[PDB]
A paper describes a structure:
Stabilizing Env into native-like trimer (NLT) conformations is required for recombinant protein immunogens to induce autologous neutralizing antibodies(nAbs) against difficult to neutralize HIV strains (tier-2) in rabbits and non-human primates. Here, we show that DNA-encoded NLTs fold properly in vivo and induce autologous tier-2 nAbs in mice.
A complex of a BG505.MD39 version with C05 Fab was formed and we obtained a density map at 3.8 Å overall resolution. In our structure, only two of the three exposed epitopes are occupied by C05 Fab, despite extended incubation time with a large excess of C05 Fab. Our structure confirms that indeed C05 Fab variable region recognizes a conformational epitope comprising C3/V5 Env regions. HCDR3 makes extensive contact with the N-terminal part of V4 thereby facilitating order in this region (N386-V401). Interestingly, W395-V401 folds back on itself to display I396 and V401 for stabilizing interaction with LCDR1.
Residue numbers in the entry:
A (entry chain F), C (entry chain B), D (entry chain D): 520 to 545, 570 to 664
B (entry chain C): 32 to 58, 65 to 142, 151 to 184, 189 to 309, 312 to 322, 322A, 323 to 397, 412 to 504
E (entry chain G): 190 to 241
The structure:
């Protein structure tokens, strides 16, 4: 189970290696600087997105957005055992923009307001 | 009551700031930014900010300085691969041109010859070419202008000088604010403010005494200066209407070239085909007459009632500031603007003579010089005036009259006419507030 | 609703857009790199302030530091419903360094010790 | 107790200053840019490591991974009151990689699984 | 009479006598966030799916 050794594995099996994958995410002088700056800017963008979702403290988290069955006509056991993450990512690639927008609107925007009201009272 | 400190992030507050802006352009060789920059956003966004009175001050705008340094460095890069003319500083014996000529001031065009080197170190050749009087100084024996002051570099003939628009875009964490208010004089609070990711494209058009190919005022002629009461300051005038400029060079000049050394070649003016005539530029009389009347009316508002306003040609200084510089086809022209400013105001066309110079120094730098290659054939160039640069001869309190003369000599003042609209700010997302709340 | 569209809104109304604002915070080759490196450093420094305060998990948080209302004699409705954030920032411009110092020292130092004492037993 | 003034103190006393230390952790153009970029990458890697451990929100945290008695033959109160951090770091320098691996592997891998089951219910 | 070839076209620079032209093996490595995949197949014509 080296880096990306999980790539051919079922989506469920792959969950065992998430930590390992995370560890590997982080004029000649100009070439070095452009590559390094981009690696950092990219890294931070992913972390900011999790921070909006409130999931930044975890590799795995749950959300309050319900699944739209039209995104994929499959059973839970079907997805977790009969597919790889590579196949899955392609299958729902049309809806990733929608899901990200829903996570912010349905959870982040709603929860911060309700918690503020409780704090205010 | 029991108020507590709270913290908010993402708060919409900004502060004045200066930062490097990223150049971009909508745009085969050209001296301009297209080689040094990236493609623009095809659909720029703009967001109006309601109830915002943000202050602008064009005279302190650092964007002007940033553009200047980028333009100078950009221009210099175009000459790095190009041919050096150091071997050409020679005795250069010359004689008067005799032909079917209407001429100019006598001696304006000369027939010169010199001993020049060849591809081989062992051999020399005798050559001849035409030169303009402006490029030649008497020692009969002559020297090329600046042979005793600087090296001369030949511009590469393949490279276009035609202006290409430049856009500036903010880096993350920064934003560019735009003043939308009509008839803004460049200072104070702007009644209507909006935010843009990038500026409108600005063309690097170089000219003196008049602003060419720029933006027009939306409704009426706008007069602005760093200090309206200080006669030392340049006054920028933006027109609400265009006035065209039609320039031509009728002579049908030809171009010949000779290889010099193993790595270089030199281009020079050959025999002129047909009659030799004076280069010139037209200014419409009727259009200009109306244009001046509008400027005078606005000047009276700034300088008071019943002041007689006159215009005049510059009293002195170098050719760069006493004449109107053009770049058409890569040829550099200097024209006498007298007759445009020859008027007094109380209550079909003009033809201006022009002269051509092949040795120029666009940025007025000591120790630098460039030789333009000659352009073959007849040149016609059509462009327009979008503003004027004026100075006062006044400051006197002893007269009921006032006189204006053309200003110029500082390229940064031309860019101000397009950049006065913009300001750069930094976004500060963090802030605090009193609202009562409790926590564990 | 767009970036800085909230600038004309009241401080209370503006709170709806905080997430939107957050998303937008993140020879010539040298000048371009300096701008990008500094943009990253500035971003990280603000995150550090939140991390010390313990507020880094949220766009909005409460603290244990009392308001000390003598800093400005205004009512909450006078502030939240009748004023912009742009105006507010000027009103407390001379107290910002004080408030930040209080948060780092008067709150975090007490909280870390109480949490450790509970952990010890 | 200025920057690194704590270094002279015993390990227990040094804990008072952790915030002070945290504040200071964050041709010619190439030297400037490379120095800044490397400082940032190092900073971010330490935060990533804490994120794996689940301690990213705190200066001080506890874990459920047991101490190996072979790592150091000392009393707990002896270490805190009779040593400096500079001395302590040397004595366990052979075991640092082992401890870091255990925190990642032996605890956080189990907690993410239990949380998934609880969230599922 | 003769001319060195291309005196009519370009400047000529002498190679420095102390500089060898002997090849040195070069390895290329990925930046962080990237990885290089290697095809292990045999009789591969450089295109299409690689089975390993
Ligand atoms: C070309 O011809 C003109 C006109 O004859 C020459 O200009 C004259 O120069 C002389 C001698 O100094 C003056 O006395 C005249 O007043 C000039 N005539 C003008 C200005 O109309 C000019 O010098 C000749 N050029 C050469 C190189 O011989
Ligand atoms: C380069 O040569 C020109 C021409 O000789 C010099 O300009 C002259 O300067 C003297 C000083 O006695 C004057 O009397 C002349 O009127 C000038 N001639 C012209 C045609 O303007 C120039 O000074 C020399 N070098 C520099 C740096 O100026
Ligand atoms: C642009 O117009 C404004 C007024 O709209 C000018 O503001 C002046 O500021 C000075 C500051 O001492 C005041 O004394 C003046 O009373 C203000 N206006 C007037 C009409 O007096 C501003 O200076 C103008 N900018 C320029 C460059 O002229
Ligand atoms: C201006 O000069 C050019 C040549 O430099 C003339 O172009 C020539 O036109 C004749 C027409 O019969 C052609 O045969 C030649 O081959 C052309 N020469 C070229 C293309 O180099 C041009 O006609 C002249 N313009 C005039 C006389 O008005
Ligand atoms: C600018 O205006 C002048 C004056 O009308 C034009 O001069 C005439 O030009 C035509 C050829 O285009 C000649 O046939 C006339 O004899 C000229 N009139 C003169 C010399 O009095 C000039 O051509 C105009 N320039 C442009 C570019 O249109
Ligand atoms: C533009 O041309 C005018 C002439 O049309 C030049 O001015 C003349 O200067 C002489 C000497 O001072 C005066 O006697 C004339 O009265 C002026 N104009 C006349 C008489 O019409 C002016 O200097 C030229 N401008 C430039 C920059 O060369
Ligand atoms: C001002 O803009 C006009 C329009 O682009 C320029 O006129 C063009 O010039 C280019 C380059 O010579 C020609 O290829 C175009 O055909 C011209 N357009 C016409 C004649 O309609 C004009 O040259 C510009 N002025 C300056 C000083 O650049
Ligand atoms: C490949 O498939 C086999 C079953 O045919 C499975 O046992 C093995 O774990 C899979 N390999 C990966 C990397 O998923
Ligand atoms: C699922 O997506 C479709 C298409 O956007 C939408 O019409 C439907 O309302 C969505 N269902 C949601 C909660 O069910
Ligand atoms: C998914 O559930 C349906 C229920 O009718 C079943 O028919 C189908 O075979 C299931 N798919 C898989 C892959 O088990
Ligand atoms: C996903 O998007 C691609 C690109 O538009 C499209 O070709 C593919 O059919 C889509 N998959 C769907 C709609 O299931
Ligand atoms: C000023 O703010 C108010 C907030 O309700 C807004 O309605 C108004 O449109 C803004 N400006 C103008 C000119 O209305
Ligand atoms: C001047 O015009 C005449 C008559 O057309 C022509 O013969 C002559 O060649 C022209 N110029 C010269 C220098 O001969
Ligand atoms: C070139 O050199 C020769 C020999 O000195 C001389 O006779 C001739 O006049 C020179 N040509 C020029 C244009 O000076
Ligand atoms: C313009 O210059 C005059 C000179 O007396 C000065 O008094 C005045 O303050 C200046 N106006 C400005 C700087 O706006
Ligand atoms: C150029 O000529 C046009 C007519 O073709 C005229 O309307 C315009 O005024 C001229 N521009 C000048 C003289 O600057
Ligand atoms: C310059 O003088 C030479 C003398 O031989 C003559 O041949 C040539 O045609 C002249 N050039 C011009 C443009 O009159
Ligand atoms: C400009 O036109 C007006 C009439 O509209 C005329 O009185 C005036 O004399 C003309 N030009 C000048 C310089 O007066
Ligand atoms: C002169 O003053 C009158 C009012 O007395 C005004 O209507 C006119 O526009 C003024 N002229 C100017 C400012 O040029
Ligand atoms: C310029 O104005 C003066 C004074 O009215 C006049 O004598 C002179 O002829 C004018 N010049 C031209 C070219 O009209
Ligand atoms: C002035 O010249 C510019 C050159 O780009 C042209 O785009 C503009 O339309 C002209 N203005 C006129 C003819 O009124
Ligand atoms: C308000 O705070 C200041 C320090 O910023 C303090 O000096 C003053 O006594 C405070 N007022 C109180 C605590 O009533
Ligand atoms: C703030 O307003 C409330 C009513 O909303 C009022 O009861 C209270 O006295 C006010 N606080 C002041 C004026 O300090
Ligand atoms: C809102 O503040 C303004 C001053 O900006 C004040 O004139 C007005 O009375 C305030 N409105 C209230 C307190 O309702
Ligand atoms: C804050 O300082 C500024 C000067 O920098 C001063 O004008 C303002 O009155 C001060 N505010 C308070 C509340 O003291
Ligand atoms: C503790 O260290 C010993 C070696 O001294 C090792 O054998 C044992 O497995 C370790 N216990 C752990 C790592 O839990
Ligand atoms: C640890 O404490 C024991 C008594 O519990 C004592 O005998 C021993 O010397 C201590 N070890 C030290 C101080 O290293
Ligand atoms: C730490 O313990 C040693 C045991 O020899 C003792 O000598 C030393 O003074 C102690 N340091 C203290 C008490 O600060
Ligand atoms: C740590 O490793 C070094 C390697 O030289 C060794 O000398 C030292 O005794 C080791 N420490 C322990 C406690 O084993
Ligand atoms: C240089 O000489 C070579 C000899 O083969 C010839 O082929 C070539 O055209 C020459 N180059 C130029 C630029 O005249």
């Amino acid at each position: 189970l080296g880096f990306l050794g999980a790539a051919g594995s079922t989506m469920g099996a792959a969950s065992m290696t998430l930590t390992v994958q995370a560890r590997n995410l982080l004029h000649w002088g100009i070439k070095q600087l452009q590559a390094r700056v981009l690696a950092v800017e990219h890294y931070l963008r992913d972390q900011q997105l999790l921070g909006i979702w409130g999931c930044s403290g975890k590799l795995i988290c749950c959300t309050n957005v319900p699944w739209n069955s039209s995104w994929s006509n499959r059973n839970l056991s079907e997805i977790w055992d009969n597919m790889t993450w590579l196949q899955w990512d392609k299958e729902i690639s049309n809806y990733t923009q929608i899901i990200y927008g829903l996570l912010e609107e349905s959870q982040n925007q709603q929860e911060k307001n309700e918690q503020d009201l409780l704090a205010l009272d | 009551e029991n108020l507590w400190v709270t913290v908010y992030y993402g708060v919409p507050v900004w502060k004045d700031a200066e930062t490097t802006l990223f150049c971009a352009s909508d745009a085969k060789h050209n001296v301009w930014a297209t080689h040094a920059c990236v493609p623009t956003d095809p659909n720029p966004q703009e967001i109006h900010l309601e109830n915002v009175t943000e202050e602008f001050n064009m005279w302190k705008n650092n964007m002007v300085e940033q553009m200047h340094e980028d333009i100078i460095s950009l221009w210099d890069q175009s000459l790095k691969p190009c041919v050096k003319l150091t071997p050409l500083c020679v005795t250069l014996q010359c004689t008067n041109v005799t032909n079917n000529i209407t001429d100019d001031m006598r001696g304006e065009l000369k027939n010169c010859s010199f001993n020049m080197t060849t591809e081989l170190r062992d051999k020399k050749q005798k050559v001849y070419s035409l030169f303009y009087r402006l490029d030649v100084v008497q020692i009969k024996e002559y020297r090329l202008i600046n042979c005793n002051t600087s090296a001369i570099t030949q511009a590469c003939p393949k490279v276009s000088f035609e202006p290409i628009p430049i856009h500036y875009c903010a880096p993350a964490g920064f934003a560019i604010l735009k003043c939308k208010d009509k008839k803004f004089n460049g200072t104070g609070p702007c009644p209507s403010v909006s935010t843009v990711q990038c500026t409108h494209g600005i063309k690097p058009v170089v000219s003196t005494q008049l602003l060419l190919n720029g933006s027009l005022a939306e409704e009426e002629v706008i007069i602005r200066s760093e200090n309206i009461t200080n006669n030392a300051k340049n006054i920028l005038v933006q027109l609400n209407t265009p006035v065209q400029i039609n320039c031509t060079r009728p002579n049908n000049n030809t171009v010949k070239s000779i290889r010099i050394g193993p790595g270089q070649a030199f281009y020079y003016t050959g025999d002129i085909i047909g009659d030799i005539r004076q280069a010139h530029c037209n200014v419409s009389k009727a259009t200009w007459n109306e244009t001046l009347g509008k400027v005078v009316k606005q000047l009276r508002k700034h300088f008071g009632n019943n002041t007689i306003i006159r215009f005049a040609q510059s009293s002195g200084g170098d050719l760069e500031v006493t004449t109107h510089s053009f770049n058409c086809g890569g040829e550099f022209f200097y024209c006498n603007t007298s007759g445009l400013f020859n008027s007094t105001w109380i209550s079909d066309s003009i033809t201006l003579p022009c002269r051509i110079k092949q040795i120029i120094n666009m940025w007025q730098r000591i120790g630098q010089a460039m030789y333009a290659p000659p352009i073959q054939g007849v040149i016609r160039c059509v462009s327009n005036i979008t503003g004027l640069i004026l100075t006062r001869d006044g400051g006197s309190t002893n007269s009921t009259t006032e006189t204006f003369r053309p200003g110029g000599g500082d390229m940064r003042d031309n860019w101000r006419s397009e950049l006065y609209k913009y300001k750069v700010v930094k976004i500060e997302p963090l802030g605090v507030a009193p609202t009562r709340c409790k926590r564990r």
